[PDB]
């Protein structure tokens, strides 16, 4: 079970935690990655839960790609989670460095709603460049199943939960 989450809602649960090692720890149902269309899963929370994989993750999604296509942005695909959970659940937030819609994220945290409990990053936070407070937000009006956070950065999280309204 998941520990030293604090309650947001009635099911979003947010902590300061590297998603890798909250993945190895827990081995939850569901690991979100934050994934971009092609699942080329180079930098950011993707990067390091392939990186986790030894690159396992990564030689599946190019199958998947290779057989599927690339995903929609706000689209995703459920995957193994190889050493870190039962299934990943790749999710293709907007990525605002690549000047996609913001609107999408709501579409993007729709697909959570599939999976009764996982474990997750902020969508489009971090490397894909929007407005984390932004994107919890989304995540709290849109998400309905429970929705564990892994948010990286102390700092980041501290914001996070003193602005949470």
Known sequence: SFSGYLKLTDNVY???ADIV????????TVVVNAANVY?????????????????????????????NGPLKVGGSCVLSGHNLAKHCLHVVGPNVNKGEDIQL??????????HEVLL?????????????????????????????????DKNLYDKLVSSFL
């Open 39 to 67: 699942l080329k899963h180079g930098g950011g929370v993707a990067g390091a839960l392939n990186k986790a994989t030894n690159n396992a993750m990564q030689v599946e999604s190019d199958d998947y790609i290779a057989t």
């Open 120 to 152: 997750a990053p902020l969508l489009s936070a971090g490397i894909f460049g929007a407005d984390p407070i932004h994107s919890l937000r989304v995540c709290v009006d849109t998400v309905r199943t429970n929705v564990y956070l892994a948010v990286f």
């Open 14 to 16: 947010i902590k300061n």
């Open 21 to 28: 090692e909250e993945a190895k720890k827990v081995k939850p």
């Open 105 to 114: 994220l709501k579409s993007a945290y729709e697909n959570f709603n599939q």
